[PDB]
Amino acid sequence: STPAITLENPDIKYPLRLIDKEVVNHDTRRFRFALPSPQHILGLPVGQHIYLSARIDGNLVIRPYTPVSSDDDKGFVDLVIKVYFKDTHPKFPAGGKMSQYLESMKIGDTIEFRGPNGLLVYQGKGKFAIRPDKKSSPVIKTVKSVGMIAGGTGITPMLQVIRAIMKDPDDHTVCHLLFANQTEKDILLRPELEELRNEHSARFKLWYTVDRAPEAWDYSQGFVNEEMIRDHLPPPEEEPLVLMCGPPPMIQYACLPNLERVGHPKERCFAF
Ligand SMILES: Cc1cc2nc3c(=O)[nH]c(=O)nc-3n(C[C@H](O)[C@H](O)[C@H](O)COP(=O)(O)OP(=O)(O)OC[C@H]3O[C@@H](n4cnc5c(N)ncnc54)[C@H](O)[C@@H]3O)c2cc1C
Prior knowledge:
Blueprint: E1 14-25, E2 28-34, E3 49-56, E4 59-65, E5 76-82, H1 97-104, E6 110-117, E7 120-124, E8 127-130, E9 139-142, E10 145-151, H2 155-166, E11 174-181, H3 190-200, E12 204-210, E13 220-221, H4 226-232, E14 241-245, H5 248-262, E15 270-271
Parallel strand pairs: 10-11, 10-14, 11-12, 12-13, 14-15
Antiparallel strand pairs: 1-2, 1-6, 2-5, 3-4, 3-6, 7-8, 8-9
Helix pairs in contact: 4-5
């Protein structure tokens, strides 16, 4: 038998009840929501995400999230969230709408989930099914390695794929992650990533860059650039799939031009 799924229809919103909130650090949370029963699973294919939607101060706000739970978890879904507080970053004085709304929720409040969504699904053993658009059929391709470039909150789509690969001992796909952040303190999910490196270093390569570095720093400083892509992603000769998720100036200026300078086919670099 298989467990009942929560996300039965992508066109339906499912209000899920908040049952636990962990303060991971000053501006990081883990939110656990109950599924419809303790025996349900979410029903989120690897590669896909959900949306949260809410009326936030009277206006509709919809944002995508990739849980840190998986379909192996029964009864709950966990989201790790970076809270963007107002009056902290000079370019974003209002902070972030959905992340501050999540931070204001009380235990027992509900929020609407919808899914699954996304043009990419990982079918296992190196094989990705990628739609060019919703309204189009998925181009499958079995790669030997995956280059992953995440910035900030773009880590969770990568982590979901990395974990799905690592937990299959017969999946020989090698993942190379280059993870960019504003500062060391702002990095999400560092213990989780380092546990994966500890356990799976032959299939999982991990590197960080930070816009500005701490005094004691073992990794890179600056935006993603050509040299970092040469040093920390598989070479284009090996035809890796390249996955990206990060802010717009990062993808547009740091990632795509430099993936091209190295020789990866730009038009095949997938952005979540
Ligand atoms: C597939 C996918 C999966 C994702 N999964 C996750 C996830 O698991 N967890 C998660 O936290 N997010 C995730 N995100 C990002 C998420 O969709 C939102 O972008 C994020 O929650 C911020 O939304 P917001 O409404 O709070 O901010 P908005 O109101 O949309 O703010 C716009 C932008 O302003 C910037 N900003 C605002 N305030 C600050 C500040 N103080 N400091 C720095 N920058 C600031 C941020 O870059 C922010 O994205 C994911 C995105 C994608 C595409």
